[PDB]
């Protein structure tokens, strides 16, 4: 039988209730929080399943959770219900005080679930003002169970309030156990880059091979099925956060939402983005490899490194994210104003069970304050740079992209969890 970490459940559900009751921003008018997971074949990033992973240690498909002021209802298959009895039966657990008692309902396979749906709907109507439900608006899972539930729920005319941003902030600070998972993810990412990827690229360059970016990305995906790069980790606990992104030869997009294209790799500036997800917890790395970079290319690259460390020095508990952003852009404006229009609009983002927290992005508008124990992907780049010495079109335009997994510390500059050496000595390839 799979053990549920009960103490972690009670700590975290208490954090959720504390913030909900505090009633700031999107929490203010919410009468009940309603979270439902359908079929998930692709294991997509979603607040609904991230919340499950946070509370229970595991995603639970075809499962509904209703958080009310004085009760909590979980509805799932008999086997998942049996699993949840570990926290539903409290057995005098001291930690159980900060949240309501749990009622478990069984999802029937061969029978109508109307009776259970009605119980949850009545619980919502009875919770606080019984009018508005907190939801994750982006999440729509397929399958018959979600169809049936949504049909039932939609008849009731509850107002839906998106709570994605406030929940992101609620779960952002990592417990030590979670940080250990993210540290392991970061170390696996670093080992795959150091031992496999960088070597592979140097082989390709030394042999003057023509390799499509897409094919190189596939090779990296295959590499993490090999135990030699996992340092003891069960291979089934390791996944890519996203398909590895390799770009070169004047075609760059510096973001994590695009895949590697089919062009042959140019021995240029080669941007390489990859991250490992270990036991559902994400990490991220970006390195640019440079073949015979000129003095001017090196100058821009070293300035990029300078900006990153300036960012880490500013990313400290209590500081507003936008103020970190402005501090870094101030350095660009002062020292290299010509790069103001070349630099990435975002400098990084909060990272966790979900890879990229859209409300935690480091940009000019973000008002959220940093807290000790939050983890970020800190990413900075320059795009659309011109190489003067370039002749062919693939040589003329280059980009520079750097990123690391970092931890907001107790005091002082943020701590870097990834370990891949980034000096020109390390990422330069000289023919």
Author numbering: 2 to 432
Quote the authors verbatim.
The histone chaperone FACT plays an important role in facilitating nucleosome assembly and disassembly during transcription. FACT is a heterodimeric complex consisting of Spt16 and SSRP1. Spt16 consists of an NTD followed by an SSRP1 dimerization domain, MD and C-terminal domain. The N-terminal domain of Spt16 resembles an inactive aminopeptidase.
Here, the crystal structure of the N-terminal domain (NTD) of human Spt16 is reported at a resolution of 1.84 Å. Our human Spt16 NTD construct consists of residues 1–510. While the construct contains residues 1–510, electron density for residues 433–510 was not visible. The structure of human Spt16 NTD reveals two lobes: an N-lobe comprising residues 1–175 and a C-lobe comprising residues 176–432. The structure adopts an aminopeptidase-like fold similar to those of the Saccharomyces cerevisiae and Schizosaccharomyces pombe Spt16 NTDs. Despite the presence of a linker between the two lobes, the orientation of the two lobes appears to be rigid across the three Spt16 NTD structures. Isothermal titration calorimetry analyses show that human Spt16 NTD binds histones H3/H4 with low-micromolar affinity, suggesting that Spt16 NTD may contribute to histone binding in the FACT complex. An ITC experiment with human Spt16 NTD against H2A/H2B showed very little change in enthalpy when Spt16 NTD was added to H2A/H2B, suggesting that Spt16 NTD does not bind H2A/H2B or binds with a very weak affinity. Surface-residue conservation and electrostatic analysis reveal a conserved acidic patch that may be involved in histone binding.
